[PDB]
Amino acid sequence: VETILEVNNTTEATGLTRLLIPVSSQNKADELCAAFMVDPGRIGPWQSTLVGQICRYYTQWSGSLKVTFMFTGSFMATGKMLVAYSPPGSAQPANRETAMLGTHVIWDFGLQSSVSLVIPWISNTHFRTAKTDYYTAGVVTLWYQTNYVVPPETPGEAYIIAMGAAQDNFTLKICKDTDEVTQQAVLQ
Amino acid sequence: VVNRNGVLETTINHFFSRSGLVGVVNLTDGTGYATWDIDIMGFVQLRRKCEMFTYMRFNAEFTFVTTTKNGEARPYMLQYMYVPPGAPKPTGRDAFQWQTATNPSVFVKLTDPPAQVSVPFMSPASAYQWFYDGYPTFGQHPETSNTTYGLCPNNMMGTFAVRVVSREASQLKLQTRVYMKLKHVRAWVPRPIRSQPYLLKNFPNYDSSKITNSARDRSSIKQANM
Amino acid sequence: VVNRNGVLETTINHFFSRSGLVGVVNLTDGTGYATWDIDIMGFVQLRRKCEMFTYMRFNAEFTFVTTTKNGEARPYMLQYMYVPPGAPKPTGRDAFQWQTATNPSVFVKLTDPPAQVSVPFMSPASAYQWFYDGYPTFGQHPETSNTTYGLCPNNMMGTFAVRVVSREASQLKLQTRVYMKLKHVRAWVPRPIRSQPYLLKNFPNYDSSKITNSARDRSSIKQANM
Amino acid sequence: ANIVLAYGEWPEYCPDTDATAVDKPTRPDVSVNRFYTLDSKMWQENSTGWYWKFPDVLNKTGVFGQNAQFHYLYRSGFCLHVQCNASKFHQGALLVAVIPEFVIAGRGSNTKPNEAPHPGFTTTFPGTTGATFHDPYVLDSGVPLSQALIYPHQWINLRTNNCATVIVPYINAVPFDSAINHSNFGLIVIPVSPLKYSSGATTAIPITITIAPLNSEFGGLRQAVSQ
Amino acid sequence: ANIVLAYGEWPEYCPDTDATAVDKPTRPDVSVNRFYTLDSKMWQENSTGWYWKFPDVLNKTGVFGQNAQFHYLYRSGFCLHVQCNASKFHQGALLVAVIPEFVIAGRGSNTKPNEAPHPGFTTTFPGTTGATFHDPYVLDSGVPLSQALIYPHQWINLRTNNCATVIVPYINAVPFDSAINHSNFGLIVIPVSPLKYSSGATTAIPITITIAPLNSEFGGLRQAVSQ
């Protein structure tokens, strides 16, 4: 089941704004919007989703993942984005020319509001361990493909909501106690 | 790709069938008996797992592990009694309740392996539910000191009493830990898994002045550190 | 000559199916708990046997034998917990980790027979390998203080914690020995059996300034003494 | 002489029922499955031996190297050919062997792992030029040389032959692997019997290595990383 | 809108009966047959147009580039996708066309070929960034723009669509060719109708190009040369 990612997990954002990725008009071209790690049990955005919470109850995971992006703006605004998954091997890509060499989707705004990116499980072992170096699966990046274009008398800022989930081939291995509860006394 | 990975570990029964700490009862034997109200949302590890669903129906297995303050295991006899709702509660170490004639009981030594019994589904409703939105009474429901807003009277299952079977005071400080395992489980209506720290055993209260973020903060949205 | 001598004893399964000392954990209970990183190349007798092959896949059986300093066997309760990678590590003798609700645990008395459990093949790869020629990371790999050249992250299997289940400090100095037996074994790529003395648990280092000959010296090549 | 098939198995593509990562791999198969020649080594009267860690010797040469450092997952087998010739009046012998998972050991007497010596990166992953043996007797790893005949191997006996060829499949615990982080096997050449001749004979004896990566598969395409 | 199949023909591998060079070609086919995105161009109120010479735009990017500059002979088809979007209150139109053998003409009035002006190398083979038109009206070649509809082409009319896609096969007089010396075709984008909007509308309109080299063949493997 798809569930929202806390991609804006910074100090400035608090409350619901932690779930909104801002998108405005640029003037420097090929700019980067967002980036995050694709390990579901790692600390970060995935900590706010259901599949991440369940993966925190197990030691090893396998299979593909899915991230859906939903654009929220006026009917009149439009644009294009490049959503790129890059398998491990180097730091996060520094430009769209490097980022487009991996797996990616080009997404334009229209009647359909959302797009889907499938992270396809490119690994060497049949399983990966949720931070138990030889793991981590790569990085997802989101770049301006063309721009955010709007007519006059319309706000120049809009938002995008990301929603993460597992796939048909997903599976988990070795149950364990999670690390998101705390004990100090006996009444709670 | 002809995948053969295995998904049997992900079922509800295998997720819930493992003993976990449920209760701790302290006895002084200096009163001579101890009692415990059976309620299993006192420890957070099992509570978080059980509150991922709205309705849950299962049988249980209860294990009792009793020790002393220093940890010794001197040979004594203990009586474990289960007192269902309505039945009289024991009043002394020698009262007439301890001659259990209809109530179930287990006599066990401190030197014996931990005691283990089986318990069925005992609710007047069709399932145990951890979330009950309402009050168990027609009334006025005052707006200042409310309480009784999450009673769920379908979940009240009696008490557990423990005593030292002896002629007189044994001067033993005992501590018995109660571990519960769920068997033959069914569940309904999954819910979000709690992110806020627990504060009360029977209420879902959280500190509003101190809300914890569901994701750890990172420096910028353009990095991948946190 | 019609030979009937028997060769069944020479198989891999019969060669590897015998318990051997794998770990020793010391507890003071003066902290109140002890931990051990599961890694079985700490003792040379099993290490030499296991390193005759490159790849090995098996199930295991773990036996725990706990005693005191003087060797007495006073009756106490101990908790053995297995903490897989990622799970929180216990922080005190009474912390919230010890109410194991998803983790496996064994409660056992010091007066009981040694505890014995079964363990499956738990590696994300297809086999355990003792020799991994490479680094588990893209980077610079400095040329002075290298390390991380033989990590083999496919072999990291969590920790083992042991505590005394008691109200307070028991003042017991305990020592628990962990013996492992291999079952249902398969092996690949035999290698030379080590001739040099071992120096480190996780590295194949040897003393180059003191190399031992693989055969004992004799006076002349024309005698047959050594 | 003959040709050694390591463990009696030919190299092959990773089949169904044995793969985990789900995407179409690339198979160049003509521009990567070919013979590459390295620069040779001068065999002298006191040479100790040389080794090459193999999924990095070709990691920077040709279309194979470009594929290896563009893709994240790799898998293939190899064909190894070592050449060394001398006259009929020369004498010597070389052992050529393939060691899967050839982990190089540090040389020192420090019993505390925190400050124990370790080989540097180049000594572990020499590249195209290889490295020379410090202690051939203990195989630079604490295990004897005499038992290296358990590995697939050949001898170059100067009175018998002048070539050594080994065909080796893919050996690993996972179907695919990273070619920048893991060296699947090493190739060792050691002169157990020293080189001898007489005055007037050629003193410059070279030893050359030629390799062919059969049945090459790459996957997980992204940007080019080599370190 | 729709998709234009140039001359109504799909790209394909060079068949029997049509080949001349005798050796096995390489077909990577997954790491070269993919979509590459270039850096975009700022469409302004007086932009004249841009062009890209195609068997050199990708000549330095990725596994395709490595194959192209390692092999001496090349052959493939292409899929071209130009993107440009604006609001519903913007207006304009762009012609996107594919010109086989797009030879750029020198601009000058010298009638003696010895001292006549000629385009420099970069203007002829711009690479990944392209070049801008000096005289879009005469197509920078002495032939009119109006008749460029004879070539396979599409329009981006801002009130109708925002993408233009052309699928083009291999056009040449020889089955194989050198990708460093010959550019088989060029891609031109020209705003015949200027871009107009009103105050408060976005002034930054980008134009982006994405290409996919279908059915890639390379042959004549040697060292890597790129000039």
Residue C189, SS3 per DSSP = strand
Measured CA to CA, the distance from residue A150 to residue B158 in angstroms comes to: 67
CA B210 to chain CA centroid, nearest Å? 27
C-alpha–C-alpha distance, residues C135 and D183, integer Å: 9
Domain hosting A83: range is 1-188
The structure tokens listed for E96 are 């996107």
> How many CA atoms lie less than 13 Å away from C13 in the CB half-sphere?
7
Residue E117: CA count within 13 A, CB half-sphere: 9
Pairwise CA distance, residues A164 & A19, whole Å = 12
Torsion angles phi and psi, residue E136, rounded to 5 = -60, -30
The pair phi, psi for residue E191, each rounded to 5°, is -85, 90
Would strands E205-212 and E41-43 be described as parallel, antiparallel, or unpaired? antiparallel
Is the distance from CB of A180 to CB of A46 less than 8 angstroms?
no
**Technique used to solve these coordinates:** cryo-EM
Question: What count of other Cβ atoms lies within 10 Å of the Cβ of residue A74?
Answer: 12
Q: What's the Cα-to-Cα distance from D17 to each of B19, B111, D21, D22, D194, rounded to whole Å?
A: 37, 54, 12, 12, 49
**Composition of chain C by helix, strand, coil, percent to 5:** 10, 30, 60
Residue type, E120: G
Q: In what order do the strands lie in the sheet with C77-83?
A: C33-37, C159-164, C77-83, C105-109
Exposure of C130 by Cβ count < 10 A (0-12 exposed, 13-18 middle, 19+ buried)?
Answer: buried
As a residue count, chain A comes to: 188
3-state secondary structure of D112: coil
Write the residue in C102, C105, C165 that is nearest to B71 by C-beta: C165
Cβ neighbours of D65 (radius 10 Å): 19
Q: Hey, is the C-beta of C172 within 8 angstroms of any chain B C-beta? A: yes
- Measured in whole angstroms, the distance separating CA B21 from the mean position of its chain's CA atoms is 8
- The amino acid that residue C147 corresponds to is T
Q: How close does chain B come to C165, measured CA to CA in Å?
A: 7
User: Which residues are CB-contacts of D40 (< 8 A; sequence separation ≥ 6)?
Assistant: D206, D207, D208, D209
Nominal resolution in Å?
2.8
CA dist., res. E67 & res. B166, Å (int): 91
Q: List the end-to-end C-alpha distance of chain D, in Å, as a whole number.
A: 39
Structure-block tokens of residue C54: 């490159």
**Domain total in chain A:** 1
Q: CB under 8 Å to B201, separation ≥6 — which residues?
A: A187, A188, B39, B41, B42
CA C99 to chain centre: 26
Q: Are A131 and A39 in contact (CB under 8 A)?
A: yes
Task: List residues bridging with E207 in a β-sheet.
Answer: E41
What fold characterizes domain D1-227? Jelly Rolls (2.60.120)
Question: At which residue do the structure tokens 């059976």 appear?
Answer: B38
The secondary element (H helix, E strand) that includes residue A21 is strand A21-24
Q: Which two tokens stand for residue B23?
A: 């209760």
> For chain A, how long is the longest CA-to-CA vector?
61
The C-alpha angle with vertex B183 and arms to B180 and B188, in degrees rounded to 5, equals 105
How far does chain C reach from its first CA to its final CA, in angstroms?
Answer: 33
Set of chain B residues whose Cβ sits within 8 Å of the Cβ of C120: none
> For chain C, which residues make up each domain, given as ranges?
1-226
The pair phi, psi for residue D113, each rounded to 5°, is -60, -20
CB B23 within 8 A of CB B40: yes
Cα A80 to the chain's mean position, in Å? 17
- The candidate with the shortest Cα–Cα distance to E56, out of E42, E44, E74, is E74
CA distances from B61 to A9, B105, B179, B184 (A): 42, 15, 8, 11
What are the tokens at A138?
A: 């790569």
For residues B163, B165, B169, B170, the Cα torsion angle rounded to the nearest 10 degrees is -90
Q: How far is CA A112 from CA A69, A71, A141, C16, C145, in A?
A: 11, 9, 22, 62, 55
Residue numbers in A near C101 (CB within 8 A) = 177
**What backbone phi and psi angles, to 5 degrees, belong to A63?**
115, 180
CB contact under 8 A, C102 and A176: yes
Chain B closest CA to D71's CA: distance in Å? 20
Residue in D11, D100, D5 with CA at minimum distance from that of residue C53:
D100
> Which of chain D's residues have a Cβ under 8 Å away from the Cβ of C203?
105-106, 113, 116, 118
Residues A66, A164: contact at Cβ < 8 Å?
A: yes
Residues of C contacting chain A (CB within 8 angstroms): 83-88, 95-97, 99-103, 122, 124-126, 136-138, 148, 151, 153-154, 156, 158
- How far is Cα D70 from Cα D67, in angstroms, rounded to an integer? 5
The C-alpha atoms of residue E156 and residue E96 are separated, in whole angstroms, by 8
Which residues in C lie closer than 8 A to residue B44 (C-beta atoms)?
96
Task: Indicate yes or no: CB of E26 within 8 angstroms of CB of D31.
Answer: yes
Chains meeting D at 3+ CB pairs closer than 8 A?
Answer: A, B, C, E
Return the beta strands (E) in chain E as ranges. Answer: 4-5, 36-37, 41-43, 50-53, 71-75, 78-83, 91-100, 131-132, 153-157, 163-168, 185-196, 205-212, 217-221
The answer to whether the CB of C163 falls within 8 A of the CB of C98 is yes
The residue written with tokens 């006895």 in the block is: B27
> Cα–Cα distances in Å, from D32 out to D28, E68, E168?
6, 15, 29
- Phi and psi torsions of D111, nearest 5°: -95, -5
- Angstrom CA distances, B119 to B59, B63, B82, stand at 6, 11, 11
Exposure class string for A172-184: b at 16+ Cβ within 10 A, else e: bbbbbbbbbbebe
Q: Are D11 and D214 in contact (CB under 8 A)?
A: yes
CA angle, residues E58, E59, E63, in degrees to nearest 5: 80
Mutation target vs B (from D14, D17, D23, D176; most B CBs, 10 A cutoff): D17
DSSP conformation letters of chain B: -------GGGSHHHHH-S-EEEEEEEE-----EEEEE--STTSHHHHHHHTTEEEEEEEEEEEEEEEESS------EEEEEEE-TTSPPP-STTSGGGS-SSS-EEEEETTSPPEEEEE----SSSSEES---S-SSSS---SSS---SS--GGG---EEEEEE-SSS-----EEEEEEEEEEEEEEEEE-PPP-SPP--SSS----SSSPPPSS---S-TT----
Helix (H, G, I), strand (E, B) or coil at C107: strand
Rounded to a whole number of angstroms, the CA Rg of chain C reads 22
The CA distance from E191 to E87, in Å, is 17
Q: Read off the amino acid at residue D166.
A: V
What is the distance in angstroms between the CA of the first residue and the CA of the last residue of chain A? 30
The CATH code of the domain that includes A68 is: 2.60.120.20
Alpha helices in chain E (DSSP H): 54-57, 62-70, 121-124
DSSP H or E run through C47: helix C44-50
- Structure tokens belonging to residue D134: 């410090």
E150-154: Cβ within 8 A, 24+ apart: E151/E97, E151/E98, E151/E99, E151/E100, E152/E4, E152/E6, E152/E7, E152/E97, E152/E98, E153/E4, E153/E95, E153/E96, E153/E97, E153/E98, E154/E1, E154/E4, E154/E82, E154/E95, E154/E96, E154/E97
Q: Are the C-beta atoms of residues E156 and E82 closer than 8 Å to each other? A: yes
Q: Which two tokens stand for residue E121?
A: 């190398």
- Asked if residues A66 and A170 have their Cβ atoms less than 8 Å apart, the reply is no
d(CA C145, CA D116): 9
CB atoms within 10 A of CB E111: 7
> Under DSSP, is residue D65 helix (H, G, I), strand (E, B) or coil?
helix
Residue owning tokens 């597992």: A166
E10 part of contact set with chain A, CB < 8 Å:
no
